[PDB]
């Protein structure tokens, strides 16, 4: 609440009121989504032999490698647990905030 548009100090600026900024959590994504160029066919990664000129990674555009790994960890193990090495901490809203 700014009572007066004038930037200089006045009596009305005793009535200005402060609100904290919104909490903003900036971090790497869960399971490090976004670091690696998956499914970009111009930035396709290579695992081939040293002398062999044939790439064993033929990656396509309409594949979703990140979501194929998110759904894989759901089935092969528990997902509510936090594994810091792969940054494996699943995105989870609070159930009392979404559904009031």
């Amino acid at each position: 609440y700014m009572p007066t548009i004038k930037e200089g100090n006045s009596r009305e600026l005793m009535g200005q009121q402060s609100m904290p900024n919104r909490p903003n959590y900036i971090a790497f994504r869960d399971n490090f989504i976004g670091l690696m160029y998956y499914n970009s066919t111009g930035n396709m990664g290579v695992l081939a032999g040293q002398a062999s000129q044939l790439n064993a990674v033929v990656d396509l555009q309409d594949r979703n490698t990140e979501l194929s790994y998110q759904l894989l960890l759901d089935s092969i193990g528990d997902r509510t647990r936090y594994f810091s090495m792969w940054n494996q901490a699943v995105d989870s809203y609070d159930p009392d905030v979404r559904i009031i």
């Binding site: 970009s40 111009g42 930035n43």
Partner: peptide, 13 residues
């Protein structure tokens, strides 16, 4: 828009 090195039309994080 995946497939590119950089999406310039993507202002969202």
């Amino acid at each position: 828009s995946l497939g590119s090195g950089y999406d310039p039309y993507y202002t969202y994080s």
